[PDB]
Write a protein that binds this DNA or RNA. Structure first.
Ligand SMILES: [Mg+2]
Ligand SMILES: [Mg+2]
Ligand SMILES: [Mg+2]
Ligand SMILES: [Mg+2]
Ligand SMILES: [Mg+2]
Ligand SMILES: [Mg+2]
Ligand SMILES: [Mg+2]
Ligand SMILES: [Mg+2]
Ligand SMILES: [Mg+2]
Ligand SMILES: [Mg+2]
Ligand SMILES: [Mg+2]
Ligand SMILES: [Mg+2]
Ligand SMILES: [Mg+2]
Ligand SMILES: [Mg+2]
Ligand SMILES: [Mg+2]
Ligand SMILES: [Mg+2]
Ligand SMILES: [Mg+2]
Ligand SMILES: [Mg+2]
Ligand SMILES: [Mg+2]
Ligand SMILES: [Mg+2]
Ligand SMILES: [Mg+2]
Ligand SMILES: [Mg+2]
Ligand SMILES: [Mg+2]
Ligand SMILES: [Mg+2]
Ligand SMILES: [Mg+2]
Ligand SMILES: [Mg+2]
Ligand SMILES: [Mg+2]
Ligand SMILES: [Mg+2]
Ligand SMILES: [Mg+2]
Ligand SMILES: [Mg+2]
Ligand SMILES: [Mg+2]
Ligand SMILES: [Mg+2]
Ligand SMILES: [Mg+2]
Ligand SMILES: [Mg+2]
Ligand SMILES: [Mg+2]
Ligand SMILES: [Mg+2]
Ligand SMILES: [Mg+2]
Ligand SMILES: [Mg+2]
Ligand SMILES: [Mg+2]
Ligand SMILES: [Mg+2]
Ligand SMILES: [Mg+2]
Ligand SMILES: [Mg+2]
Ligand SMILES: [Mg+2]
Ligand SMILES: [Mg+2]
Ligand SMILES: [Mg+2]
Ligand SMILES: [Mg+2]
Ligand SMILES: [Mg+2]
Ligand SMILES: [Mg+2]
Ligand SMILES: [Mg+2]
Ligand SMILES: [Mg+2]
Ligand SMILES: [Mg+2]
Ligand SMILES: [Mg+2]
Ligand SMILES: [Mg+2]
Ligand SMILES: [Mg+2]
Ligand SMILES: [Mg+2]
Ligand SMILES: [Mg+2]
Ligand SMILES: [Mg+2]
Ligand SMILES: [Mg+2]
Ligand SMILES: [Mg+2]
Ligand SMILES: [Mg+2]
Ligand SMILES: [Mg+2]
Ligand SMILES: [Mg+2]
Ligand SMILES: [Mg+2]
Ligand SMILES: [Mg+2]
Ligand SMILES: [Mg+2]
Ligand SMILES: [Mg+2]
Ligand SMILES: [Mg+2]
Ligand SMILES: [Mg+2]
Ligand SMILES: [Mg+2]
Ligand SMILES: [Mg+2]
Ligand SMILES: [Mg+2]
Ligand SMILES: [Mg+2]
Lengths: 63, 386, 109, 183
RNA sequence: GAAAUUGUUGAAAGGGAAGGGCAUUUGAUCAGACA
RNA sequence: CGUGGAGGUCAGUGACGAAGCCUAGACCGUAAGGUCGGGUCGAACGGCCUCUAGUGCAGAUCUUGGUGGUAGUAGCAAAUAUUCAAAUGAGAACUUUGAAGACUGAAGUGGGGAAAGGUUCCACGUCAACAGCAGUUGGACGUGGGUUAGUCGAUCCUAAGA
RNA sequence: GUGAACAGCCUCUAGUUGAUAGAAUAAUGUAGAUAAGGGAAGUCGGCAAAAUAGAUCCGUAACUUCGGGAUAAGGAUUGGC
């Protein structure tokens, strides 16, 4: 099972580096089928791929 | 070409080879000359090295700047529960040297010694001496003629004794068995003594006394494979030298075209047999004696065991020999104390010491207190306590 | 035979990690534990919970806590029959501190 | 076929082969010899242990500057190793022999490995780059492995010749007498 | 389908090389000649 | 004495086995060598009188090819660092996904280009060799897909110079 | 962010987590550190190493092409609130 292509595709469709695309390990069958950008787009739409939050860099001590 | 500058060779060629000893129990190469006029006794004793502490005592040495003044002195303590006598072995003289011709054994043998006769106790059927033990049965006939034969022949007699290792904090559980020459009376009187002491027990006070000069036979601490610098006390080669500098620069001339037996080389260091002599007994302690560690001058009830107990050893709940200074071997090692081979007059030998104070604070750090009582005194109540 | 048990132990990681190189301490911990389970459950197969992993790496490679309170569970094995029918799962127990607990049995049902 | 020299009864043996195998010839030579003549079943359990590091393979030829282990005591040896890839190739061929043996219809309980022979398959070249611009051969030493399993059979009975005796006139006259004399 | 070189099997020897010469013991092997 | 080739001869040997090769089997010769048996083999070959020469190897730091001992030995130690689980697969230290621990720290291990390469890009399949452990992974192997301009370049102009 | 700073050191975005692996920690090494008292006695030679260092204030000789020599030398100070 090999989802790098989908993870790369995930990063581009969403607008975010691969360091922040989440490929749901339990939906691993459904994901592999997603060969196109349109297919990934649906998979993002319904939570099968999610954006993953930015690591905080807080300015509170700088303030 | 010729040295350049003369300097003494590094290290002693009388302690070669510098290999690992053939056993932990160093051998007694020699016993004291026999004087058959005196009573029968052992001429050596088995123990275990516990540890070290400090002593304070006045000094009796006319002429010395320290005559009649206190000195502080290091001492070792070896755990010394009674040894148990289970055999006699009788040697005869031959033009090929001393040869053993029989051994007579006790009827009953402690599991401890039996354990020594084995390499897998737990799995064994423990059948050792079970047929020998029978020999006693029939009136005695066969055991007798063996004692008898020792008496008829035999130029020297040794006993077979072993340690009561269970009376000791050690884990090691398998005891130590060894031959001690008997040096009291006539050959017959010797074996009689042995026979009488079968399964019977002997204590240090029956072989050592206060202020006696004794030797110690033991195997030296081990260190594994050692480069030439620390093993022979060779010069460190200069910092600038390539391919390393704890070395000998020249391993020999060009002829003899062979490395010679007399140059220093990397190799095993320690775990050697040594027979080190002239250790004065400063104390012969008794195990059933609180105020082991106490003195005429001290008086506090306390035993020699330091607070927290002898580091890496344990407690000392038996008789001990306390010997001035240090001794070959290390904490927990079997160790033979031996009667000296000569009658020293030394003045240093002959001095009759009398301890004033035995240190008894923790060796496990900067000990500030002799006893838990003293420690309570000085500190007061703690958040634990009453 | 088998047995199927769950107990909760505390393991002294400190004396086991003593000396170990800094880049090897959290990794040594993983191994050291595995070895600890096997010594208790007699079981070669030893699995560590992903949460137990986190517990261990919780302060980076060289910052492993001196004591971990674990729960070891000897379980039966299923599928494609392994060498041995038995295996241990290890997991972290959520405890205020891992200091002061002797070892206990967990009545399982 | 055409294996190496065997002395065995082909009707009661089965055989197996692998050729050109990327296992070390030296290593699997040593591991083939720890098996030679063994009861098939004792041998298979044996290799299994080797892999567990519980018994070792005694290195007796290709072994200078090998390590040492207590696990060679059993074979009177100080150098022994645990050649994993070798073991798994040999026990692979062993399994094959068994299967062939089962097909021939042979009592699987009498099976011992009667022939086991590795020698050298053609080498295989890669190259390493050395200092100062140079190249060196960097080469695989693969092996051919062959073994034969036979069923143990007891006895051998007797029979051979009869040694025809030849006595001179004086030799058969003393004999003629000896008995005419006594018994 | 030689040789170097290698695996197995069989036989033999081997106290810091091995191989060689004259000679015989021992073992293995073999030709001839007899009527 | 022995080899390649030539004239003559023995109406020579031979698929019912020529030649070659193997053989601590036999026999002739002081020797160069010659003869036979047995095994292997498969298409040609030899005695005698002569003719002829690219005609005989242990060496030439000889030529080319092959092979050893060295040796399962030196080694595979620079660039801080890895870990738990699941999934997949005959097979997982090394593939994918999730978790964790880190790193590069915008003078980047980020995002693009010039020279140079030339398909390495991308998909699917996929491990014999290759990636100095491995391999289910790959810049590898197999089969395919892919590079869209009135405005971006070239094209035009002139420079040293040709 | 600290700081004079495109320095070093930590971080966000993006990207990596690739460099055979396991077990031990003998000698001798490579690379990194420390040593009582003495202080160059070592050595061809202080080689190597150690010492010094930022900023503010004070103080600064010979000599000079009057521009320097000069951070000469020598001192004090420095956090938090
Ligand atoms: Mg002189
Ligand atoms: Mg020995
Ligand atoms: Mg006798
Ligand atoms: Mg050292
Ligand atoms: Mg010295
Ligand atoms: Mg010394
Ligand atoms: Mg020297
Ligand atoms: Mg140099
Ligand atoms: Mg101490
Ligand atoms: Mg350490
Ligand atoms: Mg073949
Ligand atoms: Mg060899
Ligand atoms: Mg060899
Ligand atoms: Mg070795
Ligand atoms: Mg080596
Ligand atoms: Mg050697
Ligand atoms: Mg050996
Ligand atoms: Mg190289
Ligand atoms: Mg180059
Ligand atoms: Mg007669
Ligand atoms: Mg062919
Ligand atoms: Mg022979
Ligand atoms: Mg001869
Ligand atoms: Mg001729
Ligand atoms: Mg010719
Ligand atoms: Mg020619
Ligand atoms: Mg031959
Ligand atoms: Mg003939
Ligand atoms: Mg023929
Ligand atoms: Mg032929
Ligand atoms: Mg043909
Ligand atoms: Mg002619
Ligand atoms: Mg020529
Ligand atoms: Mg020649
Ligand atoms: Mg030649
Ligand atoms: Mg030559
Ligand atoms: Mg010549
Ligand atoms: Mg040549
Ligand atoms: Mg060559
Ligand atoms: Mg190998
Ligand atoms: Mg190596
Ligand atoms: Mg190297
Ligand atoms: Mg890895
Ligand atoms: Mg970080
Ligand atoms: Mg960082
Ligand atoms: Mg920077
Ligand atoms: Mg990179
Ligand atoms: Mg690009
Ligand atoms: Mg290119
Ligand atoms: Mg690609
Ligand atoms: Mg492959
Ligand atoms: Mg490649
Ligand atoms: Mg590889
Ligand atoms: Mg491979
Ligand atoms: Mg292609
Ligand atoms: Mg293509
Ligand atoms: Mg334009
Ligand atoms: Mg145009
Ligand atoms: Mg990149
Ligand atoms: Mg490398
Ligand atoms: Mg390693
Ligand atoms: Mg100093
Ligand atoms: Mg000074
Ligand atoms: Mg000087
Ligand atoms: Mg000076
Ligand atoms: Mg000097
Ligand atoms: Mg000079
Ligand atoms: Mg000088
Ligand atoms: Mg310098
Ligand atoms: Mg300093
Ligand atoms: Mg100046
Ligand atoms: Mg202030």
């Amino acid at each position: 099972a090999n989802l790098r292509t989908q993870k790369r595709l995930a990063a581009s469709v969403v607008g975010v580096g691969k360091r922040k695309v989440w490929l749901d390990p339990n939906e691993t069958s459904e994901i592999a089928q997603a060969n196109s950008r349109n297919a990934i787009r649906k998979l993002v739409k319904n939570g099968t791929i999610v954006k993953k939050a930015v690591t905080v860099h807080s300015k509170s001590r700088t303030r | 070409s010729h040295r350049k500058y003369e300097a003494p060779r590094h290290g002693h060629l009388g302690f070669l080879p510098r290999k690992r000893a053939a056993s932990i129990r160093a051998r007694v190469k020699a016993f004291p000359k026999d004087d058959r006029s005196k009573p029968v006794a052992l001429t050596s004793f088995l123990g275990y090295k516990a540890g070290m502490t400090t002593i304070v005592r006045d000094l009796d040495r006319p002429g010395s700047k320290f005559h009649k003044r206190e000195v502080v002195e290091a001492v070792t303590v070896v755990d010394t529960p009674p040894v148990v006598v289970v055999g006699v072995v009788g040697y005869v003289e031959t033009p090929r040297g001393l040869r053993s011709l029989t051994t007579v054994w006790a009827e009953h043998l402690s599991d401890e010694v039996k354990r020594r006769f084995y390499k897998n106790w737990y799995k064994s059927k423990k059948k050792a001496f079970t047929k020998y033990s029978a020999k006693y049965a029939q009136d005695g006939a066969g055991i007798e003629r063996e004692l008898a034969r020792i008496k008829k022949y035999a130029s020297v007699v040794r006993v077979l004794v072993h340690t009561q290792i269970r009376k000791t904090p050690l884990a090691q559980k398998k005891a130590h068995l060894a031959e001690i020459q008997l040096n009291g009376g006539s050959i017959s009187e010797k074996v009689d003594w042995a026979r009488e002491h079968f399964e019977k027990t002997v204590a240090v006070d029956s072989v050592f006394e206060q202020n006696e000069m004794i030797d110690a036979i033991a195997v030296t601490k081990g260190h594994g494979f050692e480069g030439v610098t620390h093993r022979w006390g060779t010069k460190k080669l200069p910092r600038k030298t390539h391919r390393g500098l704890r070395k000998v620069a020249c391993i020999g001339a060009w002829h003899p075209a062979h490395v010679m037996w007399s140059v220093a080389r990397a190799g095993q260091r320690g775990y050697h047999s040594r027979t080190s002599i002239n250790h004065k007994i400063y104390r012969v302690g008794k195990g059933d004696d609180e105020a082991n560690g106490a003195t005429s001058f001290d008086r506090t009830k306390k035993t020699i065991t330091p607070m927290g107990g002898f580091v890496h050893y344990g407690e000392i709940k038996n008789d001990f020999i306390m010997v001035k200074g240090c001794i070959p071997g290390n904490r927990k090692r079997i160790v033979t104390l031996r009667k000296s081979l000569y009658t020293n007059t030394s003045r240093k030998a002959l001095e009759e010491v009398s301890l004033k104070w035995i240190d008894t604070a923790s060796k496990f750090g900067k000990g500030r207190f002799q006893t838990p009582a003293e420690k309570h005194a000085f500190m007061g109540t703690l958040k634990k306590d009453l | 035979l088998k047995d199927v048990v769950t107990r909760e132990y505390t393991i002294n990681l400190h004396k086991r990690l003593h000396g170990v190189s800094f880049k090897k301490r959290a990794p040594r911990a993983v191994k050291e534990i595995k070895k600890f389970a096997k010594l208790h459950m007699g079981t070669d197969d030893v699995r560590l919970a992903p949460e137990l992993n986190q517990a261990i790496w919780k302060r980076g490679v060289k910052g492993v806590e001196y004591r971990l309170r674990l729960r070891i569970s000897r379980k039966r094995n299923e599928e494609e029959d392994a060498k041995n029918p038995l295996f241990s799962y290890v997991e972290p127990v959520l405890v205020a501190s891992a200091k002061g607990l002797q070892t206990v049995v967990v009545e399982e049902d | 076929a055409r294996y190496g020299a065997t002395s065995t009864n082909p009707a009661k043996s089965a055989s197996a082969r692998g050729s050109y195998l990327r296992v070390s010839f030296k290593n699997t030579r040593e591991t083939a010899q720890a098996i030679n003549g063994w009861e098939l079943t004792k041998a298979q359990k044996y290799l299994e242990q080797v892999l567990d590091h519980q018994r070792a393979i005694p290195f007796r030829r290709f072994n200078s500057s090998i390590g040492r282990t207590a696990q060679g005591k059993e074979f009177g040896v100080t150098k022994a190793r645990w050649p994993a890839k070798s073991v798994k190739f040999v026990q692979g061929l062993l399994q094959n022999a068994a299967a062939n043996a089962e097909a021939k219809g042979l009592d699987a309980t009498k099976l011992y490995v009667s022939h086991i022979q590795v020698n050298q398959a053609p080498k295989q070249r890669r190259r390493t780059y050395r200092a100062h611009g140079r190249i060196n051969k960097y080469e695989s030493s693969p092996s051919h492995i062959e073994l034969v399993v036979t069923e143990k059979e007891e006895a051998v009975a007797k029979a051979a010749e009869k040694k025809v005796v030849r006595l001179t006139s004086r030799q058969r006259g003393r004999i003629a007498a000896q008995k005419r004399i006594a018994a």
